Design a protein around this motif. Structure first.
Motif, PDB file in Angstrom:
ATOM      1  N   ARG A  16      11.373   4.246  -2.432  1.00 28.70           N
ATOM      2  CA  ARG A  16      10.410   3.092  -3.447  1.00 28.70           C
ATOM      3  C   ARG A  16      11.471   2.879  -4.623  1.00 28.70           C
ATOM      4  O   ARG A  16      12.423   3.385  -5.016  1.00 28.70           O
ATOM      5  N   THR A  37       0.985  -1.239   0.215  1.00 25.92           N
ATOM      6  CA  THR A  37       0.200   0.167   0.152  1.00 25.92           C
ATOM      7  C   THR A  37       0.910   1.372   0.081  1.00 25.92           C
ATOM      8  O   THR A  37       1.887   1.365   0.630  1.00 25.92           O
ATOM      9  N   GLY A  38       0.486   2.284  -0.977  1.00 23.63           N
ATOM     10  CA  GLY A  38       1.192   3.570  -0.843  1.00 23.63           C
ATOM     11  C   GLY A  38       2.334   3.620  -1.682  1.00 23.63           C
ATOM     12  O   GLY A  38       3.260   4.495  -1.898  1.00 23.63           O
ATOM     13  N   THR A  61      -1.772   3.192  -8.010  1.00 20.83           N
ATOM     14  CA  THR A  61      -2.647   3.851  -8.666  1.00 20.83           C
ATOM     15  C   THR A  61      -2.176   5.287  -9.448  1.00 20.83           C
ATOM     16  O   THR A  61      -2.595   5.653 -10.451  1.00 20.83           O
ATOM     17  N   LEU A  62      -0.826   5.584  -9.402  1.00 25.69           N
ATOM     18  CA  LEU A  62      -0.138   6.808 -10.062  1.00 25.69           C
ATOM     19  C   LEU A  62       0.047   5.881 -11.411  1.00 25.69           C
ATOM     20  O   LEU A  62      -0.254   6.511 -12.280  1.00 25.69           O
ATOM     21  N   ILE A 112       7.709   9.927  -6.282  1.00 24.96           N
ATOM     22  CA  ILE A 112       6.480  10.413  -6.807  1.00 24.96           C
ATOM     23  C   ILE A 112       6.542  12.188  -6.409  1.00 24.96           C
ATOM     24  O   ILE A 112       6.866  12.412  -5.166  1.00 24.96           O
TER      25      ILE A 112
HETATM   26  N1  ANP Z   1       1.722  15.543  -4.337  1.00 24.42           N
HETATM   27  C1  ANP Z   1       2.527  14.449  -3.870  1.00 24.42           C
HETATM   28  N2  ANP Z   1       3.853  14.527  -3.895  1.00 24.42           N
HETATM   29  C2  ANP Z   1       4.697  13.671  -3.412  1.00 24.42           C
HETATM   30  N3  ANP Z   1       4.210  12.425  -3.239  1.00 24.42           N
HETATM   31  C3  ANP Z   1       2.908  12.089  -3.554  1.00 24.42           C
HETATM   32  C4  ANP Z   1       1.962  13.395  -3.669  1.00 24.42           C
HETATM   33  N4  ANP Z   1       0.760  12.617  -3.789  1.00 24.42           N
HETATM   34  C5  ANP Z   1       0.761  11.406  -3.487  1.00 24.42           C
HETATM   35  N5  ANP Z   1       2.264  11.111  -3.356  1.00 24.42           N
HETATM   36  C6  ANP Z   1       2.555   9.766  -3.011  1.00 24.42           C
HETATM   37  O1  ANP Z   1       1.757   8.955  -3.547  1.00 24.42           O
HETATM   38  C7  ANP Z   1       1.262   7.858  -2.618  1.00 24.42           C
HETATM   39  C8  ANP Z   1       0.203   7.203  -3.132  1.00 24.42           C
HETATM   40  O2  ANP Z   1       0.297   6.475  -4.337  1.00 24.42           O
HETATM   41  P1  ANP Z   1      -0.767   5.508  -4.819  1.00 24.42           P
HETATM   42  O3  ANP Z   1      -0.651   5.356  -6.336  1.00 24.42           O
HETATM   43  O4  ANP Z   1      -2.156   5.963  -4.455  1.00 24.42           O
HETATM   44  O5  ANP Z   1      -0.289   4.188  -3.964  1.00 24.42           O
HETATM   45  P2  ANP Z   1      -1.365   2.573  -4.117  1.00 24.42           P
HETATM   46  O6  ANP Z   1      -0.118   1.651  -4.149  1.00 24.42           O
HETATM   47  O7  ANP Z   1      -2.132   2.668  -5.336  1.00 24.42           O
HETATM   48  N6  ANP Z   1      -1.932   2.682  -2.544  1.00 24.42           N
HETATM   49  P3  ANP Z   1      -3.237   1.821  -2.131  1.00 24.42           P
HETATM   50  O8  ANP Z   1      -4.273   2.095  -2.963  1.00 24.42           O
HETATM   51  O9  ANP Z   1      -3.404   2.307  -0.604  1.00 24.42           O
HETATM   52  O10 ANP Z   1      -2.763   0.330  -2.140  1.00 24.42           O
HETATM   53  C9  ANP Z   1       1.418   8.570  -1.224  1.00 24.42           C
HETATM   54  O11 ANP Z   1       1.557   7.700  -0.287  1.00 24.42           O
HETATM   55  C10 ANP Z   1       2.487   9.275  -1.299  1.00 24.42           C
HETATM   56  O12 ANP Z   1       3.905   8.843  -1.179  1.00 24.42           O
END
Ligand code: ANP
Ligand code: ANP
Ligand code: ANP
Ligand code: ANP
Ligand code: ANP
Ligand code: MG
Ligand code: MG
Ligand code: MG
Ligand code: MG
Ligand code: MG
Lengths: 470, 471, 464
Positions: free
Chosen positions: C418, C257-258, C262-263, C439
């Motif tokens: 990461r 997670t995190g 999603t990005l 990110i």
């Molecule tokens: N403006 C920003 N600047 C820097 N890092 C950011 C910013 N916005 C988001 N992040 C990073 O992006 C992460 C979220 O990435 P995301 O793609 O949502 O992860 P994920 O693996 O899909 N999470 P999950 O759905 O909970 O399993 C956050 O935890 C931050 O570390």
């Protein structure tokens, strides 16, 4: 001094240690759609074809015309046997005394040696209590023994693992009892046969899987597999000469090859090279794919410089693609057997065995593996089987299904982290009957196939996936 | 005090602590195909062959001619017994209990019978007899048979394996003695067991005991009755690898169980092969029980190691018995071993491998098998070499998974060791009861001539993990 | 020879290996609400619509008006069909055996009917009938309908799902053909299934197959490849994948997670819409508003893409429905919007509640549809362990995936970093590096591999 009559059904005779006792009655019991009618017809059909013994089929429900129609898709000349007075269907849609005399007439008229009764349940439902049923079955059985006929009698069940018949009497009156089952586990059905009891003789014990194919019932008694497969020192090539050297001059033709490793290690590559060499030597091969579609396999193979289409068009390659969950493992096996018998390959591949284990009994899988393994070694076909491990690095096991002892040759593929990058390695872990290189050599995948380089002699904990540079 | 009558059935008298109570009736209950009739005939057969006690078989369905023909499969000359008036089959089957009792009574008097079998009472009570009827009527039969002073076996039917003992929930309570035959289907395999639930006035073994029906009839193996009374000598026997013998303090012990454990491909079979070869070189007989490889494969691989099992098999010194673990259940496998041993009568035996026989069996059913084959080997004074494949290929923290380490006297641990990015092999005499042994985890290399044991990895740590570190 | 008649029910003819045997009766049994009636009307309806064969529907309880009203929710023009003398409903409801025959015989003749549906035969015998009577009475009804030359469907009632097949323990042995409908409750959730138990004289598929009831009736769904590349939205990732993702491939993004799944599933999508192509996002974790806010902070303007007609977003909690229903919701939405690229976020969420075996069927179904429709598919799976996950998935779906992207946390100097890695790419070279990435508000930035470290995959590395 109890003699037996062959049913002619492949495997049933084996499980019965020769067949059903002569002059006696055998009870075949099962739930709806277990194969009682099919088995009973089989019993009569082989009587007339192979031993020229006339037979009588007594029906209390199914019309004669429907019985012949429902047996038409087994390739039997029943209509002609009826016309030639070799098979008589007696429609029966103090009744038992009447039936008895009516059957007796037909026996004497047609000189019958085999009789089928399907189904006795229907008769006794009229209004017979357990006391009445017991005395009435005993009469019918005794009289049938008086005429001197071998009889197959069908009964109905409600459960699979419950009362053998309906009234809890028919089994204790019968000398011989057969149970057909059709069990539902994981939304899939598995047909099995059991010989519960043959008075005065021997028989195999337990349930034995079966299928109903083109010519009828096919039983595969796994217990009636003999550990007597032949073994030579003749070698075959992997398609990778360095691997052939590592394996001490190539794989043995008479051997089972296991390639094991995490996803993306290059298992499918090694099977593709194994098949390629068969076709390059103008020999036939079959690939049984359970993970990838053929179109996908074709692209990926052409990206390795391997032309599978060419091999198919030459008539040297057969590719069978199927989802594991599409059928039961007994059926999967029969497909493998039927497809091999059609193409008569010299080399065979399963990609992957670990796919056929998903959502199946660990035991049921082992039964499958021994059967395909046993078949290959029996049929003198070189087998290359693939296995995907769940843990991508560190797996201290060769198989999660613990199947390693069945294989002759084990190729271990594994990732290795070298300087922040994902490298791979190959080891000839085991090789019965031959020396092999004991090295955990690096290997790389190119557009022209695999390239086995050298061991990581300046590293430690290579087998863990996360080594340390000394 | 209640005296017991030997039945002469193999193992039944042990579970009965002597036999069936004399002058009393024993209920034998079971589902169809449990072996109720076979038991009954055996009881009567042995009555007349051993002690010349005439017997009467009361049948309510099966014809006398069928019982005789069905008994022929065991090689009992019952036809002679009937002619010489030592066995009498009373046919009480349909014309197409006081009256029956009177027939039975006077049949006993005519043949001077001491034993009686009634098969089956269930059938006669499936006329119209109700709970109160069946109870009063069984009581009448039983009481009278005690009046005559005959030992009786009585058969009843059941529907389930682990439900009511008979049909009417009454027969077990009126009977003085109750035997339950079971034919349980776990997995897709059947396992016959016998249990003695109840012997009034006497003792008996408790629980279920496996049995098989063979060529001379029923054979019961009660592991409980087997005793810890096997002999122990200092006589040594060679492995076939002189350096291993030195490591074992001058060869293996004859009166011992040798276990070789290790991952696949380590060389367990190679060591078995050597152990067998040695016997044949000393003009001794050995059996190999192979459950993984076939004679052809075994012989091809042996010739790749420099071993000729053919010559040994020609000279009548080696018998290889190949068979899948699925061919039979363990109880049956145990019999096949004992029988084949009792025929060939070997000095050494080999099981390659035990891990194969644990496939698709419970942990306790395998243990019970292990206790049996070991105990048999030890109480017959035959050296035993057993193989075990481990599920992990490096760094197994356990010797065995099935916990059979305590039963074995000698343990040889084979492992892989990563040295310089190459898979090496190492051999260790982990345990040797009654002797000194080399404690070294010594490397070995498999060649064409056999194993060549070398020195330990003295410049390494974490060797047992399989992933060492150079110091 | 035994011949079969197509039902036209989606999938039933596949599982029947052709359809129901012609001129015979098939028993349909199930507990209440399984879909016996709906199945029988679907048999008749399709008889008139596709083969112009008239049909009769015998009812012993439900009224004709109610039947038509209940059929209305499928868009079945049964009104017209009754008017055009195609479908006739024989009301045998209370205000016998020989009576009902003659009535049906007359109707069969009068309307020239080739298909008949009887619902329910249980109810008739729910007057009185011992096992013998029931068996004989059903045997007659079947024997007669056979003479008339009609293919019949007969409904029966069950009390349990895995118990007796009918009620009187007799109907199955008389009938030539037996279909079982089940509605199994498991984990407070219901699942519909169809089984062909027995077809005398023919073959059929064995076992239980899942089915749904949509707005066209019952849907049963039983169980090439190009080198065309599509971009990730991250140039460096495209280079790592040997020139981008294949347009005929399943992409899995696995990680804790995190990590940034999603990005990556946002950049993919943005890239499609930047190429003037349609895309759908099936979300089961975050809301459209949350997704929009976070996308904006990443620099991605979804609101425009939705307005420009090149992006749809379907957000729904996994618990909304069931897997079989979820799969239909995807299928329907794909056909409606017709995308170039699909994205599920996440598959790990859709695995909550269901069984491992139940889930595996979803993935294959969803996977197959994309490749069948030639749609690039980006899927996400959240791993349970935040560091040291030596397993890609716990569900064992790696083989099904073509491209695997592994995202992991790495501890460098008291800080949480990461890394991403192209773990697998079928039919292509890929970069083997476990590259650092960060990110930002501009999106991801793939940097260098940690060449100076060891045990990076562990997450707890050692500076060498
Ligand atoms: N403006 C920003 N600047 C820097 N890092 C950011 C910013 N916005 C988001 N992040 C990073 O992006 C992460 C979220 O990435 P995301 O793609 O949502 O992860 P994920 O693996 O899909 N999470 P999950 O759905 O909970 O399993 C956050 O935890 C931050 O570390
Ligand atoms: N010679 C033999 N060798 C091995 N097994 C045998 C032999 N003869 C009989 N059997 C077995 O014994 C079974 C029948 O034993 P039997 O004692 O007749 O059963 P039962 O319990 O009396 N049956 P039932 O009358 O229905 O209650 C057969 O089905 C065989 O499996
Ligand atoms: N053209 C290529 N050039 C270089 N490497 C390639 C090429 N094509 C494929 N590969 C590599 O080969 C891998 C696939 O090998 P493959 O034989 O499919 O492995 P596998 O162990 O059978 N995979 P799986 O069945 O999914 O567990 C890819 O992940 C790449 O690393
Ligand atoms: N001629 C030979 N030269 C060198 N090494 C050989 C030769 N023949 C066999 N080997 C080696 O010996 C191994 C086989 O040893 P073996 O005794 O069969 O092992 P195992 O532990 O019994 N195997 P398994 O039954 O599967 O658990 C092969 O994997 C090779 O490494
Ligand atoms: N001609 C055929 N070709 C292929 N499969 C067939 C054929 N006939 C029957 N079958 C298969 O066998 C099943 C029924 O076999 P059958 O022997 O009629 O069952 P049964 O046990 O007698 N049925 P029941 O009368 O209800 O007790 C069908 O459901 C098919 O799966
Ligand atoms: Mg039938
Ligand atoms: Mg693969
Ligand atoms: Mg008996
Ligand atoms: Mg309804
Ligand atoms: Mg997310």
């Amino acid at each position: 001094q109890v003699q037996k009559l062959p049913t002619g059904i492949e495997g049933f005779d084996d499980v019965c240690h020769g067949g059903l006792p002569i002059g006696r009655s055998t009870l075949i019991s099962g739930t709806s759609g277990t194969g009682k009618t099919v088995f009973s017809l089989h019993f009569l059909h082989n009587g007339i074809k192979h031993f020229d013994e006339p037979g009588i089929f007594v029906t209390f429900e199914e019309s004669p015309l429907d019985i012949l129609r429902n047996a038409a898709s087994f390739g039997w000349n029943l209509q002609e046997m009826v016309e030639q007075d070799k098979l008589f269907i007696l429609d029966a849609s103090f009744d038992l005394s009447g039936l008895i005399e009516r059957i007796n007439y037909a026996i004497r008229k047609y000189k019958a040696k085999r009789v089928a009764i399907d189904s006795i349940t229907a008769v006794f439902q009229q209004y017979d209590a357990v006391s009445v049923v017991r005395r009435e079955i005993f009469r019918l059985i005794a009289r049938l023994k008086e005429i001197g006929v071998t009889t197959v009698m069908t009964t109905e069940r409600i459960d699979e693992y419950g009362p053998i018949a309906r009234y809890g009497v028919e089994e204790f009156v019968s000398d011989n009892v057969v149970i057909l089952r059709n069990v539902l586990e994981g939304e899939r059905r598995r047909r099995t046969v059991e010989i519960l009891k043959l008075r005065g003789t021997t028989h195999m014990k337990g349930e034995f899987p079966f299928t109903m194919g083109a010519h009828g019932i096919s039983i595969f008694p796994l217990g009636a597999m003999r550990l007597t497969q032949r073994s030579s020192n003749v070698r075959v090539s992997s398609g990778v000469p360095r691997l052939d050297e590592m394996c001490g001059g190539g794989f043995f033709k008479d051997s089972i090859i296991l390639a094991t490793g995490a996803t993306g290690t290059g298992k499918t590559l090694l099977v593709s090279k194994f098949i390629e060499d068969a076709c390059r030597n103008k020999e036939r091969a079959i690939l049984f794919a359970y993970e990838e579609s053929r179109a996908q396999l074709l692209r990926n193979a052409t990206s390795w410089g391997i032309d599978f289409e060419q091999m198919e068009q030459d008539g040297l390659l057969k590719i069978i693609c199927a989802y594991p969950e599409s059928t039961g493992l007994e059926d999967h096996l029969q497909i493998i057997k039927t497809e091999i018998s059609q193409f008569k390959p010299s080399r065979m591949a399963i990609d992957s065995l670990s796919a056929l284990a998903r959502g199946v009994s660990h035991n049921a899988f082992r039964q499958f593996v021994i059967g395909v393994t046993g078949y290959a070694k029996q049929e003198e076909i070189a087998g290359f089987f693939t296995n995907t491990s769940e843990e991508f690095m560190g797996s201290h096991s060769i198989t999660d299904s613990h199947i390693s002892t069945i294989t002759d040759t084990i190729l271990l593929l594994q990732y290795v982290e070298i300087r922040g990058e994902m490298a791979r390695a190959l080891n000839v872990f085991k090789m019965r009957g031959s020396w092999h290189d004991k090295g955990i050599r690096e290997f790389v995948i190119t557009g022209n196939g695999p390239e086995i380089k050298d061991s990581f002699s300046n590293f430690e904990r290579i087998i863990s996936g996360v080594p340390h540079r000394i």
